[PDB]
Every structure is written in C-alpha cells, then in structure tokens.
Design a protein around this nucleic acid. Structure first.
Lengths: 56, 120, 46, 110
RNA sequence: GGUUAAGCGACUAAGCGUACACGGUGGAUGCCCUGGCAGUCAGAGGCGAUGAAGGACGUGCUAAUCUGCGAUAAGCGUCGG
RNA sequence: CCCGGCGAGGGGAGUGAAAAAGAACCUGAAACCGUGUACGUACAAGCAGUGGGAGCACGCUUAGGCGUGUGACUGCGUACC
RNA sequence: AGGACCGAACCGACUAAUGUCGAAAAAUUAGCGGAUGACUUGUGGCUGGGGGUGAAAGGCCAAUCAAACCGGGAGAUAGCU
RNA sequence: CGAAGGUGUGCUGUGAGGCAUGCUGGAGGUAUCAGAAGUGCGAAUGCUGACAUAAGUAACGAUAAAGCGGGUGAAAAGCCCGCUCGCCGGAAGACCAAGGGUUCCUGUCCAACGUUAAUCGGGGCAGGGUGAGUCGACCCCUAAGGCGAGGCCGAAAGGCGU
RNA sequence: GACGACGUUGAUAGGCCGGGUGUGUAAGCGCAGCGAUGCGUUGAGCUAACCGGUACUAAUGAACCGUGAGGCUUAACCU
C-alpha cells in the first residue's frame, strides 16, 4: 500500500501510455435526409435512415 | 459464472427489479414512447411482449392475468380494447428500439422504446 | 458520544461573567490584563 | 494570419483536458468540431465551447476563411488551486486542493 | 535485363531521454515608504465622585466597518488666529 | 464590436511610454507542468557519470576543419552526511 | 410484600462480527444483564492540585492524571544525542 | 542612446570569484584603499511558503427504491407538477424547553460552498416577516447555595458568618 | 481488453407458434351442502435460461486506417 522510493516522472509517463481517448471519428450520413448523425444513432431532429422516427 | 444464464440483474434486488419493470411497462403503453438506458430498453422488451401476446386471444381470465402482472386496470383498459385489432397479424415482435444517444446526466447509453404501429 | 461542552448561558454567566470575574481581587487582575493586552471581547457578552 | 483563444481558470485538471485535446492536435477545424461534438466527456464541453470561439476570432478579427483552416497548437497548462480542507478520520484533516486549469486554442493557416 | 537462393541491411516510435526556443504555476531577489526598535534633548510624571482608564449602543444623504462625537451625537456657543 | 449561457473567459479596438504593465496588476528565479524543433530509443539490464567514439542534425569560417547539440557502442566505476 | 420473577422504554457494556489512513480519536448489525431499586434523568449549586473525590481501578477531575491546564521563574539543566 | 536583479554567452584567475556582453528589466549602483559584522548552507524526523509523488488509484458517509411524461431552461438521473412504485408510523410525525441567532419567506444569481452536475439549496445580492391586561420570563415568596452592614478571626490579601 | 458467431446473399439475439419440462385439477359458470368446502367442466391452467422452425423488430449505402510490384552485393540458372 505504500511507496518506499518515489518513481520518476519517466515511469509516470509510461503508465499513461495507454489512457488515450478512443476517437469516435466514424460519423455517418443519412440515406434520404443527407444530414450527419453518429452511426447507429439518431440526430437532434429525429432522423434515422431518412425517417422522422421520434418527431421531437 | 453466468454460463448459459439470462435476465440481467441491473444492480437491484429481485423484488425492486420486478416492481420497476411493472411501472415502466405501465408507463410504456400510456405515452407510447419512453427514454431509458440501453439495457433496460433491451430488457423491457423481454417483459412487455408477453402482454400484447396474451391480449389478442381475449378472455375473462386473462384480464386478471394482466392485472396480476400489472395491478393497473387503466393500462388494462388500453389493452384488449384497442390493442386487439391493432395486433392481430404481428406474429412476434412489437418493439422497434431506437438508439438515441448519451445521457447528459451521467453518461448512460440512452435509447427509445416504442410500439411499432405509430401514426401520432 | 456525550461530548464535553454541553453548553448553557446560566452555567456560563455565573461562572465566567462580568460581575463574577470582577468580584474578587484575584479575578480583577484578569479584567486588568485583558484590558492591557487590548482584547475587544472582555469575557462573555451575549 | 494567426489567432489565439484562451479559456482561463477552467475548473478541472490538466490530464483531464490533455486527453481530448490530444486528438485535435494537427487537425482541420470541421473534423475537430465533429470529433469534439461526440466525445462524451466534460473537457469536450470545455474546449469545444472555446474552439468555436477561436474560429470566431478568425471570421471576425483575422481570416474569415474557415473551410481550409487549421489548428496548429493547443496546450492546456496548469493554474491555481482552491485549497479547501477535507476531513479524514480519527481527528486528522486533509489539505484538499480543488484543481484549476488554463487552456489555449491557437488557430492559423500553416 | 529477368529468376530461385544466400549474406547483410535504414526509414516505423504508443511513449520515454537530453539541449534550445515558448510560456504555465509560483511570489524568491533588487528597489520603495506615512511601520517599528534603540536613544540624544528638554517637558510632563497622572487620569478619578463639579464620575476615569477600558467597553456597549447609538449619530450622517447612507448599507456596512474604521475616525470623531454623544437624544445639542463627523457636531453648539465663545473670544482669536 | 464578434463568440459565449444578456456567465466566466478571450480575441480586436481605444488610452497609455509599455497591457510578453489589466485589477490574481512593478520586478517574476527554482521545484513542478506542458508545446515545438533536433538527436538517441522497443535483445538491453545495474549510483546513471567520466575516457574513448561512428553517424545524423546545425552556427560558421573559409572551403582545412574547429564550435555547439545528441551521443549507438566501449573501458573503468557500489550516492551524500 | 419483594434491593422477587418475564420483558419493552430508560440504562449498562458480555460475546462475535465489522471498522480500526474508521460513517465514529470507541462506533454500527446479531444477539446479552437488569428494568419500583443501593436505580434512572433533567435543571441549579458545593468541594480543588500534594489538594478534591472515589461500592478502591492509582480510577476521575473538559479525549491528556503515580499529581491536570495557562502564565511565570526560565533561554532551567543535560558529562547526552 | 538603459542601474540592480533575472536569463544565456565569450573571455579570465591555482580556487573562493572576476570582467565584457545579447535579451528581459525600468531607477538606482559604486572604483582604489581601509573600518565594523544579522558575512557565505544540503542535511539538524529544523521552521515557513509553495509544488511533486502514491494516482487519475481510494472513496463519495448506513444495502428506505426507483421508474415515466410534461414544463422552465443554453445544457436535466438530482429542481417544480402530475402519475405509480418503496420506506418511517411511542418515528425517519407534529409541538416546547435548552442551545443556535435570520438558519423562515418572495425576487434573482451559480465564481466559490453542497464529497458530483445543478435552473435547485439551511450558499451569496436585495427586500420582508416575529403584532399578547390572560402564553414564558421580568415581577411578589423561599430551598441547595453565594455574597455579606455591625462583628469575630487572620502576616497582607483574605477566610467564616448574623 | 482479447478469441468466436452473424450484419437483410441474414436464425446472431429478443419476440412468436409448437413441443419438451416443472407445479398440480386455474379462473369463470352449474350442481351438492343452512355454512367452511366438495364434485363436474379439467392431468385442466400457468409455464425463467431448454429444443425445432418463422425474419415480426433490432443487427444500414457508406465513412475510416491500410496503397500504387517491394534496397545493396555475390553465386547458381534464364539468353
């Protein structure tokens, strides 16, 4: 539970070698509305494969 | 170790779990759409689809059966009285899940459950 | 737990009050040191 | 022509804003707005509210061009601390310091 | 010029190291004074029941606190500058 | 004036000798923290330096080669009080 | 009638758990001993450091007690780090 | 037409150091030779201020419990309403004394505080509200008990007491 | 985190019809009983994850990283 001899800022870096946020670059474009949602999701205006699905 | 089990626990005791899925399914058919998280959406489906299955073949005894599982006759009033000819032909599924997005409250995978036949 | 300061103003007044501490000569020196050490609140006042 | 926007004293920590403002290093703006509109975090609330304020400083003060407009440098650097006192058990305290951070967004056409 | 094999063989760098350029936090150094200590020189060497030292509560154009003052309350009269 | 939540914060403009003097305000070191460029680095172990040293990268002279950065690999080497 | 029985309140702390950088500088869940007495609680007083008080443990005297705490002797003294 | 200080740089001395200079800096510095000391820091589990590390780990404070729709709004698991669900009920209900002293309420705001966000709050800004011949005290009467005119007693204070 | 099965050229999941399984004579009517209840309907009814099928819903066109015949020298075979 304790540290006896403080690790350098070197090894503090290499522990942070894998924290990097996964990119969500894979956007989609609508079939018959042309707008952009996230893939397998709905827009801000209720479109999903060219349908007013939620009408909100 | 879950190997070939089912019915996710959703981090509540069984007594709490069953009593929520009542009052979401009561809430589901009254407003016809709900926003929930993804698993509750994914597992309200496995609970509600018995109801409109056991309400096409209308009987006297099945009224209490959807009252023993519901204890809400106003929801039972919408069943059997509109839902009958609404679902004669759908041999099977009645929910088109929609993956909406992300809860700005606490980063949940939000979603949308509906009955299929929508015109309002 | 029953913590030590279970307060009052009736215990407080007749112990650490003005006329209590400015009764005797041994009390009076405290009132004549809190003066000279320049404290605002002399002993206890409401 | 070059322009810079800064949000000073953003109420978080340096590694919390370093992680999403690592992806938008060396990007164009419209792919950066689209990688920050759908990153589910709090720093993506922070700097995407400021990265759009940087392109405002182009279309208004510097180069109105936004289509082919790059982001050159972006580096979140530390700020002060709100040293409150946290109570730990058995009578002893704990000097918490609520962290605070500064972010620059630098926008130009290299 | 092509072909099989044999030997040898960089640029890759998730991060990390070092030097420079860049700030980031930080508030040390130099500089500054109506702050304070030690004394020289005279003067005083007391205030107090024709109500003290130290305080409370009020007073202005005012919300507050400091200074001053006290139902005549940031001030009255009086003789001067 | 633009952007923002008619927030915070910030970029221009105007004052000003200067806003890398802006109310957290003269000067602003070090620890610590990042940005960029250059080099080394994923078969090598060990007080992390020193002696030697290829290549690469640069300021240059004067084109013969020094200066600075890094430093593969190698010889020794078990911190201070 | 009972310093009588059973058992809540109230009280006390027996056993185990948990906790023991605690939710707490002595607790929480499961039980346990009593519960019209030599009991329990509230409020207002009295006693005082070689002194109080004690169904006596050197227990208690503001989480500290084989002599409390603050200031003053006093910058004690230290053949000792 | 740039003092000290800071920050690099080329030179220089056997070392402690010195001298010239680029940038930053914006008003003070001090030769030569001598005089006096709060005169040179790595340690003392030294003091003080600041910043690392463990670590983005642990934990979020009782294992009474949520779920949905609408609205306000820039953004809503937590705020306001409605609809059910679940928990306390010799209490986790409602009044009072103690003790706290605006903590109650409307408008408004989210920097900070609330172990999170927050339009909400016992938070900040502003205003408002507490109305008694009978309620409690003050007031008339004593207990335990404290002072204590004369007095007794004691180096002095002061102790006991009518 | 990996490995595996599918993504409308679909049985990968949920639903659904049936079967299987488990519990036992559902409810509601009528009869017998003043009544509790017993009988008939009725080995009915209800049935988590099990097995066999059915696309009813959910598993989209893309977008994306990954490229553009692969260095030096010698030998042995192509001519």
């Amino acid at each position: 539970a304790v540290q006896q001899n403080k690790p350098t800022r070197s090894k503090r870096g290499m522990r942070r070698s894998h924290d990097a946020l996964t990119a969500v670059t894979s956007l989609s474009v609508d079939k018959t509305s042309g707008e952009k949602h996230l893939r397998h999701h709905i827009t801000a205006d209720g479109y999903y494969r060219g349908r007013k699905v939620i009408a909100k | 170790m879950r190997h070939r089990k089912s019915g996710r626990q959703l981090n509540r005791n069984s007594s709490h779990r069953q009593a929520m899925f009542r009052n979401m399914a009561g809430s589901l058919v009254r407003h016809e759409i709900i926003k929930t998280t993804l698993p509750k959406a994914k597992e309200l489906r496995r609970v509600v689809e018995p109801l409109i299955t056991l309400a096409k073949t209308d009987s006297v005894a099945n009224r209490r059966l959807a009252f023993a599982r519901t204890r809400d006759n106003e929801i039972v009033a919408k069943l059997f009285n509109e839902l009958g000819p609404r679902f004669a032909s759908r041999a099977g599924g009645y929910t088109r899940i929609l993956k909406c997005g992300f809860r700005a409250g606490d980063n949940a995978p939000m979603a949308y459950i509906e009955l299929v036949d929508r015109s309002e | 737990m029953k913590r030590t300061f279970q307060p009052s103003v009736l215990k407080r007044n007749r112990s650490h009050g003005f006329r209590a501490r400015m009764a005797t000569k041994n009390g009076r020196q405290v009132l004549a040191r809190r003066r000279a050490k320049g404290r605002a609140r002399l002993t206890v006042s409401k | 022509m070059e322009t810079i926007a800064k949000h000073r004293h953003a109420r978080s920590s340096a590694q919390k804003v370093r992680l999403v403002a690592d992806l938008i290093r060396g990007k164009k703006v419209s792919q950066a707005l689209d990688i920050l509109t759908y990153t589910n975090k709090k720093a993506a609330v922070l700097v995407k509210k400021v990265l759009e304020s940087a392109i405002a400083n182009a279309e208004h003060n510097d180069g109105a061009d936004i289509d082919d407009l790059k982001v050159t440098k972006i580096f979140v650097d530390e700020g002060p601390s709100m040293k409150r006192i946290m109570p730990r058990a058995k009578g002893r305290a704990d000097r918490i310091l609520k962290r605070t951070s500064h972010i620059t967004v630098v926008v130009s056409d290299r």
